[PDB]
Short mmCIF file of N, CA and C and ligand atoms in Angstrom, two decimals:
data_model
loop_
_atom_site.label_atom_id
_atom_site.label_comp_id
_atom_site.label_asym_id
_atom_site.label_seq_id
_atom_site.Cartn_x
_atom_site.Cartn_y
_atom_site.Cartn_z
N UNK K 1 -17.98 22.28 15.12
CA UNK K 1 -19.16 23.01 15.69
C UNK K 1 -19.33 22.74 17.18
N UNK K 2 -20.10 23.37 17.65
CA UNK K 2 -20.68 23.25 19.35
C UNK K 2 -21.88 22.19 19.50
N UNK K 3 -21.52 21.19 20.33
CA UNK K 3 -21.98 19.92 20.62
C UNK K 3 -23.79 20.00 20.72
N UNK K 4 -24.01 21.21 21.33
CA UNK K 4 -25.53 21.58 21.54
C UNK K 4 -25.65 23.01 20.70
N UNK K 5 -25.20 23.22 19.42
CA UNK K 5 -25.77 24.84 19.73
C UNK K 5 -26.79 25.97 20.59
N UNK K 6 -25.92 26.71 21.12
CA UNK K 6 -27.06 27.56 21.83
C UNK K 6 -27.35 29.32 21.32
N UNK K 7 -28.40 29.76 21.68
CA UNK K 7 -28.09 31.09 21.77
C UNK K 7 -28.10 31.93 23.39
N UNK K 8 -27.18 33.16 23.66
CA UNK K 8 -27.29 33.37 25.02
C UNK K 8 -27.07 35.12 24.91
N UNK K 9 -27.37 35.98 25.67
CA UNK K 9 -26.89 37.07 25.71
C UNK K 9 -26.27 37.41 27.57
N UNK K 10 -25.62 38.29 26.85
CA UNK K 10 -25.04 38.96 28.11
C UNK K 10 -24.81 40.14 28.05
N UNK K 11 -24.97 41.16 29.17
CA UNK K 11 -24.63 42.46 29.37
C UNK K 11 -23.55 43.26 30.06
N UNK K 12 -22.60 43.49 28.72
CA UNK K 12 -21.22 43.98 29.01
C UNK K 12 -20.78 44.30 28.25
N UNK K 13 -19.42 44.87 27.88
CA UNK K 13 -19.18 45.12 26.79
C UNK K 13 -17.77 43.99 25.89
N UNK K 14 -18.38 44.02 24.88
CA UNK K 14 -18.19 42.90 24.15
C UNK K 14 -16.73 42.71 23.62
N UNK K 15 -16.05 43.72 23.83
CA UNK K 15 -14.44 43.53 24.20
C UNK K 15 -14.08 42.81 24.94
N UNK K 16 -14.76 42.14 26.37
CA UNK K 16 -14.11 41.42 26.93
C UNK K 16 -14.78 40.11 26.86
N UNK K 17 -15.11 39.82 25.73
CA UNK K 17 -15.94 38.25 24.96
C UNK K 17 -15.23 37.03 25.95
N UNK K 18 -16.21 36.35 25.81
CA UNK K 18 -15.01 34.87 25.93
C UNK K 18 -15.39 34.28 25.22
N UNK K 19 -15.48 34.35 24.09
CA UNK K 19 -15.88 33.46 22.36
C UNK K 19 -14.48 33.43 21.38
N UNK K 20 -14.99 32.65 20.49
CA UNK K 20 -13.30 32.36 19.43
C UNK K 20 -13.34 33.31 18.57
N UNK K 21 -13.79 34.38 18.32
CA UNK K 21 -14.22 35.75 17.16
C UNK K 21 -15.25 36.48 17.68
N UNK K 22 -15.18 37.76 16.96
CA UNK K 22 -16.10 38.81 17.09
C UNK K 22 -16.29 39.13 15.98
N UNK K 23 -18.05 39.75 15.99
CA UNK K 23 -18.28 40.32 15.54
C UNK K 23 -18.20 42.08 15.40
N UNK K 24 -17.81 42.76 14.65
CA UNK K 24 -17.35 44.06 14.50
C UNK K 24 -18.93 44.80 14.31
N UNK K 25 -19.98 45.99 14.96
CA UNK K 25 -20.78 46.82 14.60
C UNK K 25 -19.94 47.84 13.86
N UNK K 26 -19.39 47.88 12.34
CA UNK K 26 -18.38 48.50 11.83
C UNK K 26 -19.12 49.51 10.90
N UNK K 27 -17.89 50.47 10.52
CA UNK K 27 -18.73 51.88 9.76
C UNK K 27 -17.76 51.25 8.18
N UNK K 28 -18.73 51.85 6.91
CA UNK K 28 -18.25 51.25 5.64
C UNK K 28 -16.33 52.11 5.32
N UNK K 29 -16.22 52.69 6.40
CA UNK K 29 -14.72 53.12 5.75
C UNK K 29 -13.66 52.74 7.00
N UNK K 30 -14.28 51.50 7.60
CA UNK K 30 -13.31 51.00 8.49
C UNK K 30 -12.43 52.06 9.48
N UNK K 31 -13.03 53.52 10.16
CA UNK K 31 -12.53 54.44 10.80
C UNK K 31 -13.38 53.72 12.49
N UNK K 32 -12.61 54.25 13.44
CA UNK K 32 -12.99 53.89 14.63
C UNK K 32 -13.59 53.91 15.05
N UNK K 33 -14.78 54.93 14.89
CA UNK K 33 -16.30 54.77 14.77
C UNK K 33 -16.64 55.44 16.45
N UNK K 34 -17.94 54.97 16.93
CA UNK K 34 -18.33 54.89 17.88
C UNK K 34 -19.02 53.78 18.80
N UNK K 35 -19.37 53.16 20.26
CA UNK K 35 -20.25 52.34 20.55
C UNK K 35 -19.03 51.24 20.66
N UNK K 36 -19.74 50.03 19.72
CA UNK K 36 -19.62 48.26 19.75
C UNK K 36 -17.99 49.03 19.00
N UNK K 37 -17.72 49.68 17.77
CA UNK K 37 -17.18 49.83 16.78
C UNK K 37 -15.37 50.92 18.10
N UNK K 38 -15.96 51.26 18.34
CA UNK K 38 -14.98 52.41 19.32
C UNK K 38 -14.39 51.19 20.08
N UNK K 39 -15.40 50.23 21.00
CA UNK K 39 -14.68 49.24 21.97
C UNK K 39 -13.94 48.53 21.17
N UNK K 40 -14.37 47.96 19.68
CA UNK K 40 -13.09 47.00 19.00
C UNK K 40 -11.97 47.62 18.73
N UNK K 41 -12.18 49.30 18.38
CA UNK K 41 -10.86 49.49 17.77
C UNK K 41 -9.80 49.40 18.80
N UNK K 42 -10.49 49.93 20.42
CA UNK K 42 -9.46 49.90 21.45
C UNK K 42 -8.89 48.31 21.75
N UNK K 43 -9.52 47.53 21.54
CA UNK K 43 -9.28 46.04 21.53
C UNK K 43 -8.28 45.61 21.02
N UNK K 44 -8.79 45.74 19.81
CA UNK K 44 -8.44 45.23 18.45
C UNK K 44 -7.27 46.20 17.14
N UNK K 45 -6.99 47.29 17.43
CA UNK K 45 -6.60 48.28 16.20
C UNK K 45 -6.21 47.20 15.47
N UNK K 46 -5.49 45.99 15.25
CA UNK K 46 -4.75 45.69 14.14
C UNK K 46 -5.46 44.84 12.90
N UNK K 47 -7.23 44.82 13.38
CA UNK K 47 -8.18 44.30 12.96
C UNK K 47 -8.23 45.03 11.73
N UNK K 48 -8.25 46.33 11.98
CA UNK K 48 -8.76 47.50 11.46
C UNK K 48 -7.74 47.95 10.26
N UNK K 49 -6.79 47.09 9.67
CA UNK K 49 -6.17 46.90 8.31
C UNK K 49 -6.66 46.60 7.29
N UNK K 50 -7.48 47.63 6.40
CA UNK K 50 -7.69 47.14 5.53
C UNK K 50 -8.98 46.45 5.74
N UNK K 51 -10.36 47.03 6.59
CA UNK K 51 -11.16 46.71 6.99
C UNK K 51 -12.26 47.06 6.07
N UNK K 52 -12.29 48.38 5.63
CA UNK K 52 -13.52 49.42 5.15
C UNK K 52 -13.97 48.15 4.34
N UNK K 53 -15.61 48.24 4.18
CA UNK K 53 -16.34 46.94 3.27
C UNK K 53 -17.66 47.96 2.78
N UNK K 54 -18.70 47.48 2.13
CA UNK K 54 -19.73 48.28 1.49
C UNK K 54 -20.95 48.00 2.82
N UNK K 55 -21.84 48.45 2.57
CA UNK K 55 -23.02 48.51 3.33
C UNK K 55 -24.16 46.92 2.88
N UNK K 56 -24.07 46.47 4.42
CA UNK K 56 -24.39 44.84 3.98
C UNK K 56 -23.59 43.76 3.65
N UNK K 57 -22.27 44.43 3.87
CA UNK K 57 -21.17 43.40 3.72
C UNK K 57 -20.53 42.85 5.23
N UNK K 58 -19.72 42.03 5.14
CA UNK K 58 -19.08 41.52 6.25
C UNK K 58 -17.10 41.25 5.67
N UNK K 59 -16.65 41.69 6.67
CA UNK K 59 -15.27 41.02 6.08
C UNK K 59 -14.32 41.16 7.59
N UNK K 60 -13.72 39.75 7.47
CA UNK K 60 -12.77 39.53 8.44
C UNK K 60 -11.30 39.97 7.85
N UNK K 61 -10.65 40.35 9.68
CA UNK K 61 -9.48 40.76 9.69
C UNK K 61 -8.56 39.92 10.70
N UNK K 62 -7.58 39.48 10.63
CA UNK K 62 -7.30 38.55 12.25
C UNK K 62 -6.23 39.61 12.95
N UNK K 63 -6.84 39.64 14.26
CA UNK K 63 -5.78 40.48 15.15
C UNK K 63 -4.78 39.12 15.74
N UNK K 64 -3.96 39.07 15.38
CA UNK K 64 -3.08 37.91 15.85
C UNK K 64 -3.67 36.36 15.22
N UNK K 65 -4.40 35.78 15.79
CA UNK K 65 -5.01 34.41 15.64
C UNK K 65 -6.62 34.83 15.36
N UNK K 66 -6.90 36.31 16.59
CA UNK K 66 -8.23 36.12 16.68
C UNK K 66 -9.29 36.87 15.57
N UNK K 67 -10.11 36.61 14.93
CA UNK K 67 -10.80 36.73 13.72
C UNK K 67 -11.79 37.72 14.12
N UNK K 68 -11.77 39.10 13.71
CA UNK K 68 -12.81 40.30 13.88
C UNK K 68 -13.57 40.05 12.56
N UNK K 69 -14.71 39.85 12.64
CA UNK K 69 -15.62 39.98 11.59
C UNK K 69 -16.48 41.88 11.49
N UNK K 70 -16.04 42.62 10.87
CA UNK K 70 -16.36 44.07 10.39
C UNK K 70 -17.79 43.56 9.51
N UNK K 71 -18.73 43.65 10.25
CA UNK K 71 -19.94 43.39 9.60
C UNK K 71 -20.29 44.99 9.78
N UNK K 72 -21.37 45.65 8.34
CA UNK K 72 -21.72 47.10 8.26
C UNK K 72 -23.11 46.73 7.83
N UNK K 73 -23.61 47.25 8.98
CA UNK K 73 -25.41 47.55 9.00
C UNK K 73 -25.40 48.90 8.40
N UNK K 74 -26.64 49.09 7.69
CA UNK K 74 -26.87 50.28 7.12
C UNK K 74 -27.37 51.74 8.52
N UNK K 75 -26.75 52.53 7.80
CA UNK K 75 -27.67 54.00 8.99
C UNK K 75 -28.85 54.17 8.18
N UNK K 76 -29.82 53.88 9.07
CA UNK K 76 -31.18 54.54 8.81
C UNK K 76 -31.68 55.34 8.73
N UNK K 77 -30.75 56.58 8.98
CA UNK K 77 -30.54 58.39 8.74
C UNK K 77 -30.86 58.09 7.27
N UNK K 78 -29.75 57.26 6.48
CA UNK K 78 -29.65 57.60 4.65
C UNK K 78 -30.33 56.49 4.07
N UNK K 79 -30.86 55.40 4.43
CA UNK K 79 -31.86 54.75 3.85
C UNK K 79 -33.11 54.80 4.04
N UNK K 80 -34.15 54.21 3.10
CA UNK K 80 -35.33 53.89 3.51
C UNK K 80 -35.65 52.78 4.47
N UNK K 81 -36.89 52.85 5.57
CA UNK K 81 -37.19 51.77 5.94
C UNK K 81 -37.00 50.21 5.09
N UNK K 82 -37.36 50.28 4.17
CA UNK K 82 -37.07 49.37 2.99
C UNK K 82 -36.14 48.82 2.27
N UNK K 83 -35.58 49.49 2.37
CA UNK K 83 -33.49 49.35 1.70
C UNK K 83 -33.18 49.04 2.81
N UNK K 84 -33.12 49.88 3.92
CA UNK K 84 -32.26 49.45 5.07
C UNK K 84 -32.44 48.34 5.45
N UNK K 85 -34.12 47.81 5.86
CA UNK K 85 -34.33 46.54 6.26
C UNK K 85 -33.55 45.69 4.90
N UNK K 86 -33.35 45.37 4.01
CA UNK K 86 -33.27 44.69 3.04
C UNK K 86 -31.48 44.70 3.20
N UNK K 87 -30.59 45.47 3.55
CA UNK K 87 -29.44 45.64 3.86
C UNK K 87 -28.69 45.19 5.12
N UNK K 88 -29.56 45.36 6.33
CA UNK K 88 -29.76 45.04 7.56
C UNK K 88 -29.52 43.21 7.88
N UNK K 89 -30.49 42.87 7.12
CA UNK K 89 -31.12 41.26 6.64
C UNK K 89 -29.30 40.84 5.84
N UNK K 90 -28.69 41.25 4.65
CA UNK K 90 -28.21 41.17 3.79
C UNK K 90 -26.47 41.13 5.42
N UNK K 91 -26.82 42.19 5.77
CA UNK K 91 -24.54 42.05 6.70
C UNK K 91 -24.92 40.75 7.80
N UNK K 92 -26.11 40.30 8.05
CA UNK K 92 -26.18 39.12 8.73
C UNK K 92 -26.01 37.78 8.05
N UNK K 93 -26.55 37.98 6.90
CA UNK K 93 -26.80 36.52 6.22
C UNK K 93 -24.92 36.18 5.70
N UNK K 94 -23.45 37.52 5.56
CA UNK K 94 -22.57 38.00 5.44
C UNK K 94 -21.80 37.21 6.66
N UNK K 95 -22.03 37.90 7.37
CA UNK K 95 -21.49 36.82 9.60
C UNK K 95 -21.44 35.75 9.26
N UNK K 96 -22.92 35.26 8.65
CA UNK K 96 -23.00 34.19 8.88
C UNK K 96 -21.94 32.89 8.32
N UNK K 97 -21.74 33.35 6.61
CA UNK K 97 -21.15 32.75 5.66
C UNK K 97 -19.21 32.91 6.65
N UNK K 98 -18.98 34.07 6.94
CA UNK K 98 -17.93 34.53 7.59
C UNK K 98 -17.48 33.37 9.02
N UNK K 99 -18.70 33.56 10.07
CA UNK K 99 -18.27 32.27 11.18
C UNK K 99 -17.92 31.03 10.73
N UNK K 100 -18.97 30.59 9.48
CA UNK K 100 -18.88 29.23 8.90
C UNK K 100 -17.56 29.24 8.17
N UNK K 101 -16.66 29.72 7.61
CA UNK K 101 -16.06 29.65 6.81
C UNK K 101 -14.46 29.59 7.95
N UNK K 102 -14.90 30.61 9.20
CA UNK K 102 -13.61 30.09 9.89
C UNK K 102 -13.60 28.94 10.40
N UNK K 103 -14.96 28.03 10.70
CA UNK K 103 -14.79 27.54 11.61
C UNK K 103 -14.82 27.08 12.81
N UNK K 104 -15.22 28.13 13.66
CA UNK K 104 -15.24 28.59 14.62
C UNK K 104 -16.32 27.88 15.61
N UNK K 105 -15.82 27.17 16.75
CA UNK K 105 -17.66 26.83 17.80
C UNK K 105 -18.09 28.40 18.72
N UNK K 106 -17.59 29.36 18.55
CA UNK K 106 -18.37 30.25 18.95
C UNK K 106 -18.35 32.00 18.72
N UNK K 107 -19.42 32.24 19.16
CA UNK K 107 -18.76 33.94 18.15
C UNK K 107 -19.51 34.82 18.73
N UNK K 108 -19.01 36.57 19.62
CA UNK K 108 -19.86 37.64 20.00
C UNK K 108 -20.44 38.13 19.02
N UNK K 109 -21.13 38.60 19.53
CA UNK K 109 -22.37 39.82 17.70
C UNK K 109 -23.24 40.23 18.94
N UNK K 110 -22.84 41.92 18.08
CA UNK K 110 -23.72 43.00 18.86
C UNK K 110 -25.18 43.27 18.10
N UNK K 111 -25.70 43.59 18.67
CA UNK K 111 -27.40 43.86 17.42
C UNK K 111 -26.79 44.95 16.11
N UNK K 112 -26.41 44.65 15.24
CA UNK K 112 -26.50 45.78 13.82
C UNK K 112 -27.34 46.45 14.51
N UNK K 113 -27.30 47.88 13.91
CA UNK K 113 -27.88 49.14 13.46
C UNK K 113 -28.89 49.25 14.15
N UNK K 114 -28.41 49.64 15.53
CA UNK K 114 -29.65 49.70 17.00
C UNK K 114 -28.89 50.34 17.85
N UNK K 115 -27.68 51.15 17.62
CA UNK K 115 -26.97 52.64 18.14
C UNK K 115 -27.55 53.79 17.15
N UNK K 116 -26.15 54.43 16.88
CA UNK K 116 -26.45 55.67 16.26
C UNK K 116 -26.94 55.54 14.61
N UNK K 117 -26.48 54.07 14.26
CA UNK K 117 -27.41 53.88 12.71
C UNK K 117 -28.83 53.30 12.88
N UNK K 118 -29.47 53.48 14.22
CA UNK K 118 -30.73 53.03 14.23
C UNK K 118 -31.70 54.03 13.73
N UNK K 119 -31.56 55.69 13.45
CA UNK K 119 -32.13 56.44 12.68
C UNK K 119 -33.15 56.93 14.01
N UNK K 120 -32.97 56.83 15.21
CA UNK K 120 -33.83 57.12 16.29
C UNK K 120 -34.78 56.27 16.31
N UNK K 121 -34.67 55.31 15.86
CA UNK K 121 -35.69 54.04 16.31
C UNK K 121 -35.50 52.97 17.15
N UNK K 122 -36.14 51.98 17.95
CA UNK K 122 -35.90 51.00 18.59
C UNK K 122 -36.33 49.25 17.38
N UNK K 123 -35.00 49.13 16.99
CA UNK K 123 -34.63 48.07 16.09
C UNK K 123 -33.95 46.98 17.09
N UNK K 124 -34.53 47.03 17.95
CA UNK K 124 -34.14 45.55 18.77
C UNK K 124 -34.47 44.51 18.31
N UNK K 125 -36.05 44.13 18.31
CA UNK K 125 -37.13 43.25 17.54
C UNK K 125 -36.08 42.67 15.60
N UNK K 126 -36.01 43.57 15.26
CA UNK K 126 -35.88 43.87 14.24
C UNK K 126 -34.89 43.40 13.38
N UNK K 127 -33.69 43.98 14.35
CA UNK K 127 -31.78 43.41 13.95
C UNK K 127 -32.05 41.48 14.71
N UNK K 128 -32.57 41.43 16.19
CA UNK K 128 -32.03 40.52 16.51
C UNK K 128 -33.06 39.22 15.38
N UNK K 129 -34.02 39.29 14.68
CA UNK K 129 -35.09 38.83 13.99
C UNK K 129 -33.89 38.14 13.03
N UNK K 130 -32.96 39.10 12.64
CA UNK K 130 -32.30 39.38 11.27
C UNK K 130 -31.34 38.34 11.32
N UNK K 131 -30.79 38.52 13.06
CA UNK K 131 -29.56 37.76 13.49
C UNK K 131 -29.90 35.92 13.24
N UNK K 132 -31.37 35.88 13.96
CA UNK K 132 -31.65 34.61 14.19
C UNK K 132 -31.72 34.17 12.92
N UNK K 133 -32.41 34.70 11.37
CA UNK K 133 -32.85 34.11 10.33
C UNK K 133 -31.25 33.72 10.28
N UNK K 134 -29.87 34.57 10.02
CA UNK K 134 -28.56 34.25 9.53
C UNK K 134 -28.04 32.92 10.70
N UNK K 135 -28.53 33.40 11.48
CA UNK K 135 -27.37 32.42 12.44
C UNK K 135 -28.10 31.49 12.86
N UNK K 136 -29.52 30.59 12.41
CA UNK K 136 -30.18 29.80 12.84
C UNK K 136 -29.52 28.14 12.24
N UNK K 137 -29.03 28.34 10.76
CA UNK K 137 -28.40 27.51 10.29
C UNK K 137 -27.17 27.05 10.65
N UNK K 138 -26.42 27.96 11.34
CA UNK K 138 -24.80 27.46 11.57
C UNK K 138 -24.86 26.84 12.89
N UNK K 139 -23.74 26.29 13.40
CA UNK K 139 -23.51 25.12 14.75
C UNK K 139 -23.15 25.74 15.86
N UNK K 140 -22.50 27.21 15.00
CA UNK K 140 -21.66 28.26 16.82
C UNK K 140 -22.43 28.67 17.51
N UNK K 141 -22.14 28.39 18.86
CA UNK K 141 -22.70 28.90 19.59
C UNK K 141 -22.64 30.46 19.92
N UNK K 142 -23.69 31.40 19.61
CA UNK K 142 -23.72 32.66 19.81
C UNK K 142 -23.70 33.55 20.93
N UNK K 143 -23.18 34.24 21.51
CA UNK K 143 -23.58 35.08 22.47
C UNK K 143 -23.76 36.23 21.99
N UNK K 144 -24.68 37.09 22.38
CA UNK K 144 -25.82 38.77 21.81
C UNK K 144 -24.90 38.98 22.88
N UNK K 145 -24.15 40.82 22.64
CA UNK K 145 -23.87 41.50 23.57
C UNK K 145 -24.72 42.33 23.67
N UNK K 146 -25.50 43.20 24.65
CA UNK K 146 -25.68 44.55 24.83
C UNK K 146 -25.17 45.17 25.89
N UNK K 147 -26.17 46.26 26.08
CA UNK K 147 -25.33 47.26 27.20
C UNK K 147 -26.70 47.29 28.48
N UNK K 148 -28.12 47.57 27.62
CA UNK K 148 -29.10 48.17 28.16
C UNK K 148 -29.78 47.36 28.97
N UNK K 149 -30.28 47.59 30.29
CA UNK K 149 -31.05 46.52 31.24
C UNK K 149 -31.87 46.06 30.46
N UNK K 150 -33.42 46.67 30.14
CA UNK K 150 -34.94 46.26 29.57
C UNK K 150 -34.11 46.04 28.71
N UNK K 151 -33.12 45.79 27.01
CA UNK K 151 -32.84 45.09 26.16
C UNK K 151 -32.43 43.68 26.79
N UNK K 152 -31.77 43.47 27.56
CA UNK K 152 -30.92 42.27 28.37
C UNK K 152 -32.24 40.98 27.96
N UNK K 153 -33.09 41.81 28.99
CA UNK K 153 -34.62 41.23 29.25
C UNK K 153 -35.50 40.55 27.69
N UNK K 154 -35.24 41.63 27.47
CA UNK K 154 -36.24 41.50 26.21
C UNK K 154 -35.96 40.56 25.08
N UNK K 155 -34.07 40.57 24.48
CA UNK K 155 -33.26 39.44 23.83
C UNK K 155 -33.46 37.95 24.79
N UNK K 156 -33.50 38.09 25.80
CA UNK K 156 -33.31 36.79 27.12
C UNK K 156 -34.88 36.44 26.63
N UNK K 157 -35.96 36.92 26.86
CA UNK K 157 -36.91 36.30 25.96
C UNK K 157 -37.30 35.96 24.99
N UNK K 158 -37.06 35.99 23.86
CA UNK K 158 -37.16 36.13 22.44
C UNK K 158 -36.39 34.86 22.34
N UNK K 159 -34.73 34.47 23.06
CA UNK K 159 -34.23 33.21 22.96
C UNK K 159 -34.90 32.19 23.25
N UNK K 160 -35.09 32.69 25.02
CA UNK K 160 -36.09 31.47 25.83
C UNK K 160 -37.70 31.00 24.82
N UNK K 161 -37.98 31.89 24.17
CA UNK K 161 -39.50 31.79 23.50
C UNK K 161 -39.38 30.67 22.42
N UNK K 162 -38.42 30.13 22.22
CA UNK K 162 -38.38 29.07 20.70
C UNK K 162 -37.77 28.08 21.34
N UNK K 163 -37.01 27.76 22.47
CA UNK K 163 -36.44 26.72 23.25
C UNK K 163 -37.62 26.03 23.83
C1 LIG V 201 -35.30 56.60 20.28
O1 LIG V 201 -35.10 55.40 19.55
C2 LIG V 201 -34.24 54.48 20.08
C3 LIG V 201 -32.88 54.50 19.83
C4 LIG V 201 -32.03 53.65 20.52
C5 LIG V 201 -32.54 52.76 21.46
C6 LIG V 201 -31.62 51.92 22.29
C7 LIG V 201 -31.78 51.78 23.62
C8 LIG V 201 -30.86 50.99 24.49
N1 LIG V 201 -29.59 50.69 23.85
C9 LIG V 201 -29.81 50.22 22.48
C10 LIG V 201 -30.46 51.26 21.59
C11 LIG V 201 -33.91 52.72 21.66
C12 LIG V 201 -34.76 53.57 20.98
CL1 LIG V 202 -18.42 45.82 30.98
CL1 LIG V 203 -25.21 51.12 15.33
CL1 LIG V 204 -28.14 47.84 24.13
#
């Protein structure tokens, strides 16, 4: 594990990590997708063997050494507020068992289902809530990718607020 665990975000895109694994924002039939999911496949294609997983699942692939975790947040287009949250909660608590099991002192993760499976909502609050309950227990140190300025801000507080 990492001597201090921390949590940190940064704004970029998460292909060019400097962590020991990624996390995958992946679609349930393992196709190239769009967003977090489009930048891994260009990254990563050889991740993407045998990837497809169910909704709320997580499953690793290793591109060479390095370990893509294909975690699938639900689209909020085809669920209820209620299922989804309950599914949402469910591909994190998934990462989590996944980082622990490689190993790993550190790991990227994009917010689940806060692109085009956010259903036109702002699930910032919401996914990263989801992230912290899964990843509060393990030792890796995390880094949040996004893209968006005011998100940058808003994750950068929410960390700083419990430190
Ligand atoms: C209209 O509902 C939404 C949908 C998406 C967003 C986001 C903004 C910045 N990038 C992350 C996703 C915010 C609100
Ligand atoms: Cl970038
Ligand atoms: Cl998404
Ligand atoms: Cl973002």
């Amino acid at each position: 594990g990492a001597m201090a665990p921390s949590y940190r975000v940064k704004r970029m895109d998460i292909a060019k990590n400097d962590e020991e694994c990624v996390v995958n924002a992946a679609n349930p039939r393992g196709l190239p997708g769009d967003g977090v999911c489009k930048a891994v496949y260009k990254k990563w294609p050889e991740s993407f063997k045998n990837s497809a997983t169910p909704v709320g699942t997580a499953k690793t692939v290793m591109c060479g050494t390095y370990p893509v975790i294909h975690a699938v947040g639900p689209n909020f287009s085809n669920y209820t507020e209620s299922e989804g949250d309950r599914e949402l909660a469910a591909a994190y608590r998934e990462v989590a068992k996944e980082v622990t099991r490689l190993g790993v002192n550190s790991v990227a993760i994009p917010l689940l289902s806060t692109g085009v499976y956010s259903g036109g909502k702002d699930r910032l609050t919401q996914s990263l809530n989801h992230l912290f309950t899964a990843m509060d227990s393990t030792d890796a140190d995390v880094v949040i990718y996004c893209r968006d300025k005011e998100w940058e801000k808003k994750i950068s507080e929410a960390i700083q607020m419990r430190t």
